[PDB]
Amino acid sequence: MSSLLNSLLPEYFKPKTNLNINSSRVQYGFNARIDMQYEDDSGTRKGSRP
Amino acid sequence: MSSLLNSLLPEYFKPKTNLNINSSRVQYGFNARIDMQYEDDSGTRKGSRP
């Protein structure tokens, strides 16, 4: 059933037809922007991985 | 004139009669609590001298 397996894919994922696989290992994932924060009595230390 | 020289003294200063001076040098002043702060794009670093 193509229909039920299609709904499992994420909303942001827009797939194309061809995929040129040339190896026996693939790292599928996503890139996200994490805005980390460390608060303490002394003060706050902010970080950001884009 | 005792009156005009009396008004120059601070409000918090409550003087007593006797002062036992035993040297040719005196460091008059006051003790205060300073709450310092350093803010930056990275974060805030707070200090306090009581």
UniProtKB/Swiss-Prot annotation, chains A, B:
Similarity annotation: Belongs to the totivirus major capsid protein family.
Organism: Saccharomyces cerevisiae virus L-BC
Lineage: Viruses, Riboviria, Orthornavirae, Duplornaviricota, Chrymotiviricetes
Location of this fragment in the whole protein: 1 to 50 of 697
Name of the protein in its database record: Major capsid protein
Protein purpose: Capsid protein self-assembles to form an icosahedral capsid with a T=2 symmetry, about 40 nm in diameter, and consisting of 60 capsid proteins asymmetric dimers. The capsid encapsulates the genomic dsRNA and the polymerase and remains intact following cell entry to protect the dsRNA from degradation and to prevent unfavorable antiviral responses in the host cell during all the replication cycle of the virus. Nascent transcripts are transcribed within the structural confines of the virion and are extruded into the cytoplasm.
Compartment list: Virion
